[PDB]
Ligand binder design. Structure first.
Ligand SMILES: CCCCCCCCCCCCCCCCCC(=O)OC[C@H](COP(=O)([O-])OCC(O)COP(=O)([O-])OC[C@@H](COC(=O)CCCCCCCCCCCCCCCCC)OC(=O)CCCCCCCCCCCCCCCCC)OC(=O)CCCCCCCCCCCCCCCCC
Ligand SMILES: CCCCCCCCCCCCCCCCCC(=O)OC[C@H](COP(=O)([O-])OCC(O)COP(=O)([O-])OC[C@@H](COC(=O)CCCCCCCCCCCCCCCCC)OC(=O)CCCCCCCCCCCCCCCCC)OC(=O)CCCCCCCCCCCCCCCCC
Ligand SMILES: CCCCCCCCCCCCCCCCCC(=O)OC[C@H](COP(=O)(O)OCCN)OC(=O)CCCCCCCCCCCCCCCCC
Ligand SMILES: CCCCCCCCCCCCCCCCCC(=O)OC[C@H](COP(=O)(O)OCCN)OC(=O)CCCCCCCCCCCCCCCCC
Ligand SMILES: CCCCCCCCCCCCCCCCCC(=O)OC[C@H](COP(=O)(O)OCCN)OC(=O)CCCCCCCCCCCCCCCCC
Ligand SMILES: CCCCCCCCCCCCCCCCCC(=O)OC[C@H](COP(=O)(O)OCCN)OC(=O)CCCCCCCCCCCCCCCCC
Ligand SMILES: CCCCCCCCCCCCCCCCCC(=O)OC[C@H](COP(=O)(O)OCCN)OC(=O)CCCCCCCCCCCCCCCCC
Ligand SMILES: CCCCCCCCCCCCCCCCCC(=O)OC[C@H](COP(=O)(O)OCCN)OC(=O)CCCCCCCCCCCCCCCCC
Ligand SMILES: Nc1ncnc2c1ncn2[C@@H]1O[C@H](COP(=O)(O)OP(=O)(O)O)[C@@H](O)[C@H]1O
Lengths: 139, 54, 344, 157, 319, 97, 103, 120
């Protein structure tokens, strides 16, 4: 776990390799989990068919992970701005686009871009403003 | 811009996004085995959620 | 049912939650849970229709394995602390088990599959008990142990439930299952504030009970398990159309009615505790719940669906009345909001 | 003997492994019956004579028998236990390998502590506490049995 | 009221049953003289003789009991049934569906009298013997296939709950006989009933109804000659042994629940109003709302029995 | 018990994995379900015995008494199912979809 | 607990036997009875939030009377290294292992 | 929360300490609301049971308006206490742990210099 966290430690826009790798893993992990629920429920017809679906979901998710990581990191270096939430939006923007492609739908890319990017941007803001998620009870 | 573009984007899209999401989450075989394994998956993930955030 | 059996069962279904609540020795809390499991199964198959046996056999397996997991937590604690009860020191995994298990008996989040299906095959009456006098028991166990449970998991099960409940409800047209889905959702809010302010869980429950109990006795007054069936309410009994309208919008969070308070104070408590991430997303999809509530509103009240000639016959005959509880629980529920400060 | 217990514990896991792979339900009957034998012995290793014979007496022949009993009456329509044995054998070995992991890293503390000069030490005096100083466990167990007779007739009808 | 409380303390149908206490229906063709046989059998054992179910039987059942206006009673005409078969509006199916609801009310009222008083009941035609009219109507152009399915669905949903007729006295008089019998009591409408339709009614009686109830209940058939001799038929009923049938298992604690059902008319026909939208059955919201505002405004109906002052109810301010 | 309470615990998890993944006959679950109660009974009895905590021995048995009835209910449902569907096979239990 | 019908009614059907130091039959004291007392008379009047930091000496000890793992560890080490000393033929079990014994 | 407080009455409704607090005026708007809340319950019942809405059950109407109100005085009497305990508890802590809740000096605006954003 010390791993994933690393993504945040080094300043954004720097060491994109590690960023992309980490982001790709998270997506892939989600892919596995997502495929699992998708196979446990709404099962397949043959073991192979399901192994394929696991692969499909895993790769698609890994891809959205990569492009998000790559776009955000690169957008940063190029723009010479490491804390501009927009960076992430461009990244989320891209991530959605990959999802759209893997689903072969321009429309999905639309919602995907907006919704996904917005979400990622909010993550950046969240980190920048020190928003706390799942907080301990401090009443 | 009125009618189609400003109705397909904000009002209608949100209509579709959900409609589609309910279709996947609610299309369930009804068989117990499937459902139960999903309980298995959950136990596994929660076991981990605790593990990694030990 | 030989009235004697009816008494023994009903006593057990009622001694079941009460032992849980009163005792402190967890073991005695477990058997309280066990007695509830044994007592409910006979009533569930009263019609003994093919759907029913399916319902009970699912409810029982889901309930039984969860009961065994809760016992394992108590057995493990016994070896990590000689005590028969969770303490500050308790290993975190020990408590998380209890959360998952108890979240299965209550049917929250990723374990929300059994409830909608058992709510579909049981009568409207036993539906109420299965939804509201069987949630008191497990919740008691959680509320007692709140200081120790994890804020992260609860929140995830909370948010998930809200979403699953909402999304599931949108598609459903069977009423029993629309309610099952709502209960999953409300149950979610309840478990969201447990780690922070248990006292509000007990409000978000009572209000749910004071809202759902009138709503179901409404569904059965005409015994309609279909929206199409509840839509012809205007012909079968016109007066309940007014309050059915407000109670369902009350079940969702719309502001003038009593239903806003549970969501409002839960949001106030979560923001007081800084979960302005979590609280926001919950409130937003909470709005999805009202959409399916209002879609039913449309069919039952705001628009008059076509009815059948044979209905004129049912009008002629005197309609067996709805118990008094309906009224007292419809009003105390639809409009108590002006009295919120004292409720909390 | 040596590791008189670990061995047994290992057998308990093995039996339950069988049940988990859902052997044919009356081939699975033994699975429990035999581990139940194993667990009977285990508790009899820590000096728990009464509790140990209590299971052998109740879960072994009372609960489990009745199970298979019904297992034959109903659900006797069965077409792979061999396949199961395959996984059983492999998993059993995998279980061993896992222990071999402890060999890589991490009994003198079996019976733990006792009162050597004593009478009124035997386990089983405790179970009788249901009547003195623990008479609420006894009543609730009694209500469950009384409820069971009424509940089952109502389930069966 | 009747409830577990009453049942717990006595009030058991078990203590109120006697040999003469049975559900006996007599079924025949459009004119089997069953009306006569019924009254007599009734006179013999003091059996409450229920009249055949009518369009306004429910109105006579409820409140004042004065006959309701046709549209208030579901707008059904047996008269129009005959003069306009295969009508565009489908009055014939609406007539049949209202008839099934009426006998459902009659059968339930009969069972309530049987379990409370203990007296038996002769109900002439019953929900059990209604299908023959629909079978003949579908065999003819009168009703279409789905119409049949809708009636069958209502029948499957409601009829099983009620216990079967103990015995089902039956008359038979060949189609020629009935047509001729029609001519004697002259009525333009009843007169124009295509024989083949009468052929289909009796047929469905003999081929499907007569045997079907023969296992579950005592079917005794009586040719016309045996008929018109209530004494003999009555004698035979008193002769048959009420053994074979589902009635054997009706213990007191089982009857209680059945009683509480018939005790609630709103439930008896709960499934009679199922929201299946076949076009003939549909009230329609605008027409239905008007008929309701108008049926509900009739004196003594605007409020529950006992509370409407128009008909002379008093003490409303303390009820 | 340090590693003798890990075998029993994993036995309960192996029994856990069992009850949660069904396959054909329902009896095998119920039967499995019982495998847990045995593992819980054995573990409760074991620690109570090496803690010399005699005040708690009542529990090891209360666990069995409640588990037995629990199973009684479970089997009556099972008999009810192979009376309505002629088999205990779970697939049949898919009407509530 | 959630509804204290027990304290109110004064009855104690469920409290007398919750800890190892409760009355054991025939007064056969449990094990770790030397500590649980010391760890619950400490945390009495002090709520949990403060029964978890300052009364940590008594739980760290009671976590060792029962689990008795540090002992297991120490001893295991003694065993392993003794194996190594025997390995170097340095050590041999004393006649204590086979010698005249006390009554 | 407030449970676990010293002296807590384990199952009591309103401890006698609540005697010290003023009793709720019977005409307190709230109790009067409960009254109206009640009358409506009554009227609603009549309606759902199809009775003359206002002219029926004039005995029940009273039971309702008088049951709800009765409940109120004794509930409000308590909720009032609970809130009053909250202050006793809250104010006390502010003192017993004074340093944590220190009095602050607020510089007269003359001294403080909030920046001025011009609208222009
Ligand atoms: C402001 C206004 C902006 C307006 C923009 C313009 C709008 C135009 C109008 C709208 C329009 O045209 O829509 C048409 C368009 C047509 O598609 P459709 O007919 O709905 O098809 C969907 C059916 O489910 C298809 O049925 P099916 O049987 O093919 O089901 C397969 C399923 C799945 O599709 C596939 O077959 C391939 C697999 C795709 C998903 C694989 C990974 C799953 C991971 C799950 C993780 C769970 C935890 O299809 C889908 O569900 C598509 C939606 C998938 C949602 C995204 C799931 C996560 C994937 C990426 C994870 C990234 C993680 C990063 C860390 O409708 C949409 O797709 C709307 C958007 C749907 C969701 C998009 C993603 C939103 C959430 C983003 C992630 C969470 C952020 C928070
Ligand atoms: C009309 C019936 C009149 C009956 C008169 C009977 C004799 C009598 O009451 O006179 C003595 C008595 C003497 O009062 P007082 O102590 O001289 O009043 C001075 C207070 O400073 C004045 O009272 P205050 O305002 O200082 O009392 C504190 C509190 C008292 O709190 C309340 O009583 C709330 C009453 C709300 C009405 O004030 C509030 O009402 C705060 C809540 C404001 C509304 C919050 C909720 C707004 C959204 C929801 C609206 C309702 C939606 C219902 C659900 C949807 C239904 C379709 O008069 C009353 O207290 C009753 C006044 C009318 C009560 C409401 C009647 C409606
Ligand atoms: C939060 C809201 C999440 C909404 C979506 C949840 C599940 C997402 C997913 O990864 O897969 C969808 C899941 C299975 O796929 P399904 O919809 O059956 O159809 C697949 C083929 N179209 O869809 C489902 O069948 C419903 C799955 C519900 C349970 C899975 C979601 C769990 C979320 C994490 C819970 C962690 C609890 C830890 C304790
Ligand atoms: C300089 C101008 C730059 C404009 C950039 C944005 C628009 C770019 C459009 C590129 C072409 C996209 C396209 O053609 O696909 C439309 C998309 C899918 O349409 P579909 O029904 O699948 O058929 C497409 C068949 N080729 O259907 C969609 O989902 C379109 C989603 C994106 C819509 C972009 C324009 C929205 C305007 C909103 C105005 C609000 C005021
Ligand atoms: C910034 C401005 C944002 C504006 C957002 C507007 C949201 C509402 C837009 C219109 C939604 C809508 O039209 O809903 C219709 C849709 C389908 O309903 P319908 O076609 O009637 O089908 C039911 C009968 N079979 O019903 C649906 O499927 C759900 C539609 C959305 C319901 C509320 C969603 C809230 C989401 C919060 C996140
Ligand atoms: C906080 C304010 C919230 C909003 C307040 C105003 C809206 C209240 C909620 C209304 C919701 C339902 C709307 C649609 C109802 C449709 C009813 C209908 O179609 O009519 C039939 C119905 C039953 O007819 P029936 O009474 O049996 O006929 C008797 C014949 N002798 O006819 C009836 O049911 C008649 C009786 C209806 C109940 C009376 C409603 C009166 C209006 C209530 C206003 C409350 C104002 C509160 C203001 C608060 C300010 C802070
Ligand atoms: C965590 C795991 C997450 C898994 C997520 C994905 C789950 C997908 C499940 C469906 C996959 C595609 C269909 C596979 C069908 C199959 O062969 O395996 C199902 C298995 C056997 O059950 P059966 O009903 O006989 O189905 C056989 C049908 N060919 O069903 C069963 O095994 C029933 C359970 C009894 C046997 C296993 C019990 C556990 C044993 C563990 C032993 C140790 C294993 C170590 C590795
Ligand atoms: C003592 C009386 C004089 C003083 C009253 C002071 C009241 C002040 C506060 C008013 C609050 C708003 C609601 C007022 C509703 C008044 C209803 C009423 O007075 O009853 C008579 C009315 C007659 O109309 P109808 O329903 O047709 O009955 C005829 C016989 N069947 O029957 C009805 O219409 C009943 C309507 C009930 C509406 C309840 C609304 C509750 C909130 C919405 C649900
Ligand atoms: N379910 C039904 N559908 C259509 N017509 C019916 C139905 N039940 C009864 N009738 C009609 O009612 C008429 C009178 O029946 P009945 O009382 O037997 O005649 P009578 O009084 O001359 O003996 C018959 O002509 C018959 O067609």
């Amino acid at each position: 776990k010390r791993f994933f966290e690393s993504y945040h430690e080094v300043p954004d826009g720097t060491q994109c390799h590690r960023k992309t790798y980490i982001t790709t893993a998270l997506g892939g992990i989600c892919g596995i989990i997502g495929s699992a629920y998708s196979v446990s429920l709404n099962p397949a017809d043959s073991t192979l068919e399901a192994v394929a679906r696991v692969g499909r979901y895993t790769f698609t998710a890994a891809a959205i992970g990569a492009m998000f990581g790559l776009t955000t990191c690169v957008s940063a270096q190029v723009r010479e701005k490491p804390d501009d939430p927009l960076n992430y939006f461009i990244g989320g923007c891209a991530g959605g686009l990959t999802l759209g492609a893997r689903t072969h739908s321009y429309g999905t890319a639309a919602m995907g871009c907006v919704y996904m990017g917005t979400a990622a941007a909010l993550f950046k803001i969240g980190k920048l403003e020190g928003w706390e998620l799942f907080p301990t009870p401090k009443v | 811009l009125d009618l189609i573009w400003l109705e397909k984007t904000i009002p209608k899209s949100t209509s579709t996004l959900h409609t589609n999401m309910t279709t996947l989450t609610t299309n369930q075989k009804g068989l117990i085995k499937l459902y139960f394994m999903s309980f298995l998956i959950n136990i596994i993930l929660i076991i981990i959620l605790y593990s990694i955030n030990l | 049912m030989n009235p004697i059996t009816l008494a023994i069962i009903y006593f057990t279904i009622f001694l079941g939650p009460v032992i849980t609540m009163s005792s402190t020795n967890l073991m005695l809390m477990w058997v309280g849970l066990e007695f509830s499991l044994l007592a409910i199964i006979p009533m569930l198959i009263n019609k003994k229709n093919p759907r029913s046996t399916e319902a009970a056999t699912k409810y029982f397996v889901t309930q039984a394995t969860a009961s065994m997991i809760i016992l394992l937590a108590i057995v493990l604690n016994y070896k990590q602390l000689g005590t028969w009860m969770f303490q500050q020191q308790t290993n975190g995994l020990i408590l998380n088990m209890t959360l998952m298990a108890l979240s299965m008996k209550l049917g929250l989040a990723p374990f929300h599959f059994w409830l909608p299906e058992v709510t579909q095959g049981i009568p409207l009456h036993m539906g109420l008990i299965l939804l509201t006098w069987q949630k008191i028991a497990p919740l008691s166990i959680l509320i007692q142990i709140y200081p120790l449970l994890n804020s992260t998991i609860i929140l995830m099960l909370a948010i998930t439930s809200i979403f699953m409940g909402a999304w599931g409800g949108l598609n459903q047209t069977q009423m029993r299952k629309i309610m099952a889905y709502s209960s999953i959702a409300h149950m979610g809010w309840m478990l969201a504030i447990l780690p922070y302010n248990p006292s509000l869980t007990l409000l978000n429950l009572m209000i749910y009970i004071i809202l759902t109990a009138p709503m179901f006795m409404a569904l059965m007054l005409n015994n309609s398990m279909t929206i199409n069936s509840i839509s012809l309410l205007w012909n079968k009994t016109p007066a309940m159309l007014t309050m059915i309208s407000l109670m369902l919008l009350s079940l969702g969070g719309l502001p003038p009615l009593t239903g806003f308070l549970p969501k409002w104070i839960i949001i106030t408590e979560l923001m007081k505790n800084n979960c302005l991430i979590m609280a926001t997303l919950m409130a937003m999809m909470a709005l999805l719940n009202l959409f399916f509530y209002t879609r039913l509103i449309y069919s039952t009240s705001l628009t008059m669906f076509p009815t059948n000639n044979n209905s004129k016959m049912m009008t002629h005959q005197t309609k067996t009345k709805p118990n008094l509880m309906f009224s007292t629980l419809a009003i105390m529920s639809t409009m108590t909001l002006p009295l919120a400060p004292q409720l909390i | 003997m040596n590791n008189y217990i670990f061995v047994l514990s290992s057998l308990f896991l093995v039996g339950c492994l069988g049940l988990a792979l859902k052997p044919s339900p009356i081939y699975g009957g033994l699975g429990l019956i035999v581990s139940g034998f194993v667990g009977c012995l285990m508790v009899l290793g820590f000096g728990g004579s009464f509790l140990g014979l209590m299971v052998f007496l109740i879960y072994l022949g009372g609960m489990l028998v009745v199970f298979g009993y019904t297992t034959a009456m109903a659900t006797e329509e069965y077409p792979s236990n061999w396949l199961i044995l395959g996984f059983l054998v492999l998993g059993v070995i995998m279980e061993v390998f896992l222990i071999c992991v402890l060999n890589y890293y991490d009994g003198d503390w079996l019976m733990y502590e006792v009162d050597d000069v004593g009478v009124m030490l035997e386990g089983g005096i405790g179970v009788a506490a249901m009547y003195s100083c623990a008479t609420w466990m006894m009543v609730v167990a009694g209500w469950s049995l009384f409820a069971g007779i009424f509940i089952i007739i109502e389930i069966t009808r | 009221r009747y409830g577990l409380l009453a049942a717990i303390l006595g009030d058991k149908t078990t203590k109120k049953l006697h040999e003469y206490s049975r559900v006996i229906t007599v079924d025949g063709n459009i004119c089997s003289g069953k009306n006569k046989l019924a009254k007599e059998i009734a006179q013999q054992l003091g059996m409450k003789h229920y009249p055949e179910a009518g369009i306004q039987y429910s109105s006579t059942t409820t409140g004042d009991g004065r006959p309701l206006d046709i549209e208030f009673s579901g707008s059904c005409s047996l008269e129009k049934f005959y003069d306009d078969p295969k009508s565009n509006d489908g009055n014939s199916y609406r007539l049949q569906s209202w008839l099934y609801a009426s006998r459902l009310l009659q059968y339930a009222d009969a069972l309530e009298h049987l379990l409370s008083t203990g007296q038996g009941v002769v109900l002439e035609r019953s929900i059990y013997s209604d299908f023959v009219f629909l079978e003949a109507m579908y065999n003819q152009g009168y009703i279409r296939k789905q119409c049949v399915d809708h009636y069958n669905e209502i029948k499957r949903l409601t009829l099983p709950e009620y216990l079967p007729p103990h015995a089902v006295i039956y008359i038979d008089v060949p189609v020629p006989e009935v047509q001729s019998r029609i001519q004697k009591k002259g009525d333009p409408h009843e007169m124009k009933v295509t024989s083949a339709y009468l052929q289909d009614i009796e047929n469905a009686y003999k081929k499907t109804f007569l045997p079907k109830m023969s296992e579950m209940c005592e079917v005794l058939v009586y040719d016309s000659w045996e008929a018109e001799d209530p004494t003999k038929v009555v004698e035979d009923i008193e002769y048959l042994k009420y053994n074979k049938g589902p009635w054997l298992k009706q213990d007191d604690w089982t009857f209680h629940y059945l009683r509480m059902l018939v005790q609630d008319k709103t439930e008896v026909l709960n499934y009679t109003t199922i929201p299946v939208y076949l076009p003939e059955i549909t009230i329609g919201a605008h027409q239905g709302s008007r008929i309701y505002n108008s049926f509900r405004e009739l004196p003594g109906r605007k409020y529950a029995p006992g509370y409407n002052a128009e008909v002379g109810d008093k003490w409303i301010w303390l009820k | 018990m340090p590693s003798t309470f890990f075998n029993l615990t994993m036995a309960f998890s192996l029994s856990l994995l069992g009850t949660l993944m069904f396959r054909s006959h329902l009896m095998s679950t119920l039967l499995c379900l019982e495998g847990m109660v045995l593992s819980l009974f054995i573990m409760t009895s074991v620690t109570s015995l090496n803690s010399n905590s005699m005040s708690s021995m009542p529990i090891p048995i209360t666990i069995l008494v409640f588990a037995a009835c629990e199973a009684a209910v479970g089997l009556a449902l099972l008999v009810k199912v192979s009376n309505t569907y002629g088999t205990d096979y779970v697939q049949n239990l898919n009407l509530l979809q | 607990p959630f509804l204290d019908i027990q304290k109110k009614l004064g009855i104690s059907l469920d409290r007398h036997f919750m800890f190892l130091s409760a009355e054991q039959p025939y007064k056969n004291a449990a094990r770790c009875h030397a500590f649980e007392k010391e760890w619950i008379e400490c945390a009495h009047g002090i709520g949990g939030t403060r029964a978890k930091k300052e009364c940590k000496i008594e739980f760290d000890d009671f976590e060792e009377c029962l689990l008795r793992y540090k002992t297991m560890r120490r001893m295991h080490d003694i065993k392993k290294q003794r194996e190594k000393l025997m390995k170097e033929g340095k050590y041999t079990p004393p006649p204590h292992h086979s010698g005249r014994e006390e009554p | 929360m407030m449970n676990g407080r010293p002296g807590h009455e384990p199952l009591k409704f309103l401890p006698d300490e609540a005697r010290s607090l003023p009793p709720p005026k019977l005409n307190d708007p709230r109790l009067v609301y409960m009254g109206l809340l009640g009358y409506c319950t009554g009227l609603m019942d009549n309606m759902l049971r199809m009775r003359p809405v206002m002219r029926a059950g004039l005995h029940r109407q009273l039971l309702f308006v008088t049951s709800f109100v009765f409940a109120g005085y004794f509930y409000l009497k308590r909720q009032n206490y609970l809130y009053a305990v909250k202050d006793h508890d809250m104010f006390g802590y502010i003192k017993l742990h004074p340093e944590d809740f220190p009095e602050k000096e607020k510089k007269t605006y003359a001294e403080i210099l909030e920046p001025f954003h011009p609208v222009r």
